[PDB]
Amino acid sequence: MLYKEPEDGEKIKFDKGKWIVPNKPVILYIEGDGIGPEITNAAIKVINKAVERAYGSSREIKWLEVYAGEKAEKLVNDRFPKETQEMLLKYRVVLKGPLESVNVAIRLMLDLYANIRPVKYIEGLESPLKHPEKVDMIIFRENTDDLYRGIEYPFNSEEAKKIRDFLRKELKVEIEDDTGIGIKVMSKYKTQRITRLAIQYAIEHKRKKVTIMHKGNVMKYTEGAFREWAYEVALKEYRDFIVTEEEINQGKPDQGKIILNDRIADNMFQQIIIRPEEYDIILAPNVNGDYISDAAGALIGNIGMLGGANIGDEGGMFEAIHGTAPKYAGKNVANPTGIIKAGELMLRWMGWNEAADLIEKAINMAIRDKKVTQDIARFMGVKALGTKEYADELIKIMDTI
Amino acid sequence: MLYKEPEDGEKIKFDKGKWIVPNKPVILYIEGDGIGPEITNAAIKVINKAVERAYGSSREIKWLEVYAGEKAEKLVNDRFPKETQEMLLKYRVVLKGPLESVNVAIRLMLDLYANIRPVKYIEGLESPLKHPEKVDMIIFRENTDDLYRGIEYPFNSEEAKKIRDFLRKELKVEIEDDTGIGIKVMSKYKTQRITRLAIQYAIEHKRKKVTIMHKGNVMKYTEGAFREWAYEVALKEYRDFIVTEEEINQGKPDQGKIILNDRIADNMFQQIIIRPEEYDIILAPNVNGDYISDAAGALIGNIGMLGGANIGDEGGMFEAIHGTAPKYAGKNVANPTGIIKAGELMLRWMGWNEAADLIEKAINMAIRDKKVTQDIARFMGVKALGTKEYADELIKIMDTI
């Protein structure tokens, strides 16, 4: 067999979207290509330290490396070996480094319909913004619906012609012939799924607000429906947990309750820059979430220091928001912060917030203390630490907090 | 006649979508609701001074007021009277204050398919950005195509059912029944005309770069087609005026030529925040143009101080990017900078660049000297100037440069 499973660990379980994590959970990891090996092993070491510091020996992640990408191609001549897939379907939780699609395959096989993008100010880090201090949001992007379904046809195709003829005769819709055509689809079920995940996360992590991003004023039956369905499932399934903005400024009490409001897409691309502190959890459809994530991440410096995840009803894949950077591979120079942040997010989803908070804290202290990798040092005029050395600094710091 | 037309003026002409402006052009204006009267009259006074200072008495705008909105309702009991429509179809160029729609009606009747959004840094204003200095761009948004055509249907409508049945049997596309449906259309012709306008503007006003905004990597036949069609008309109709980014990093020289490149939408939402100086003219389809405009304008912070326009092959409507501000109506408090900026844009389209430059410099100087209205004075600890007084200050300044 290609893998030796830890006989000391147990798979993480799920009952209805909720992660039931054993004290010795088996968690998979994929090194990744290029800088993958260096940053991922660094992440694992940092994570193990946070878990031991926070919980002592009462908890311990039983890591199981699986192969994918170049490493897999060189070892067994298959970039996504059958055994790797089997371990994924079995343990369903993986921390994976950058890969040169394997990412799409993992998301599809584990049905990780939600893309999670936390973006929080990191003290010490330069920002294009004069006041990034209060940036603390998390984007919940539905990642299987919308125009990204790929239902589209070229302007000069027979398919497009059939659509145009159909729209004209059956719907009396006027459309010229020199037109490319895409079908935007918005599912009630898909909208409810992501909405539930967002509210449940708010409850579990003491988040105070969820904002629905939409262009419902013009895209009435797709994004406007998204908004409607989101409020609908929130009020029907999380009644005594949430309070709508239409209730606050109406009389209802929001004391100890999560505020559920909504904003027009165009306004959000504006406010994220002018006053990003207004947002906590952002709930949005596929396309909007894609664009708002890019803007939000730019609010802080170096997007390569952010982590993210794709979550499903029974599984999750956590990764850094950056590429393989083949130029620095094996040079012990890459910044492991991003993949470490993916680990922090993973810790939070597992309910191990104490270990996650220790990592967040150690990073803030390391960066404020100018103990950073080259990508940052080059700007704060100081000697850079290597990948391994930087990870070790985070470790010694956690040992004192 | 309801309107006494200036017997001394001449109408602006159009040749291949190029403005042929007489020395005494008739230009229509609509005061607008709320603060409209105060700011539009101030703009007219500043525009006339700029024209007088730059060309003496050799040129003079023959303004002609037409009614729309609440003033029209009171005077002729019609929000958009027939007489107003007649003047618009005749003179085709109008400076319009904010209105509480008339905006859509003017755009349709004059086929003003291009939404123009200039946004450049103004010396002295608060900015969310640490470095807004080199922000100097103009967004050219196709404003009649894309999802905004409104071809959409509710998930439980018989129309939506007809569409899903069609796609299933004729296209063999699988789609659930609980889905709202929108149709994204992208026209080759609509894309070409907006592209021609953008390049022609770059040529006319010595602009050096045009960047196409798109998500063609995932929306290949709509936005990807937009990109392809834009490059096509550019290379085919403006060959000796432009050079592509691909050609430059291929060996070709860009000396004396406008640069034409493209960027994926998500990348632009990032770069517009971290380094907006990279953009000059942004060419984009309806939806992207909408979102990018919001993000771009947020870079300077004072949205109410921006001007904009809708241009067609034979006309133009210029307006400020703000509402009627009823709370400030008739209190001589409103900031007229946005509508003046719209007037500055109108002068550039007219080819009267000297007058436009005067307005631009005067505003810069006024702000740098802290001679501003309350919306700005509030943050610089100086006494605010009224609407009339601020306009008069710009006028005394223009008499000096």
Numbering used by the authors:
A (entry chain B), B (entry chain A): 1 to 100, 109 to 409
Q: What is the paper's account of this structure, in its own sentences?
A:
The thermoacidophilic archaeon Sulfolobus tokodaii strain 7, which grows optimally at 75°C and pH 3, has an open reading frame ST2166 in the genome encoding hypothetical IDH. In this study, we expressed, purified, and determined the crystal structures of ST2166 in the apo and NADP+-bound forms at 2.0 Å and 2.4 Å resolutions, respectively, and discussed the mechanisms for cofactor recognition of prokaryotic NADP-IDHs.
In this crystal, the asymmetric unit contains two monomers having nearly identical overall structures with root-mean-square deviation (RMSD) for least-squares fitting of Cα atoms of 0.18 Å. The final model comprises 401 amino acid residues per subunit and 463 water molecules. Residues 101–108, part of the Cd loop and d helix (residues 97–118) equivalent to the phosphorylation loop in EcIDH, are disordered. In the structure of the apo form, putative isocitrate-binding residues (Ser109, Asn111, Arg115, Arg125, Arg149, Asp298, Tyr156, Lys223′, Asn225′, and Arg274′, the prime designates a residue from the adjacent subunit) involved in the binding of isocitrate in prokaryotic NADP-IDHs are exposed to the inner surface in the deep cleft of the active site.
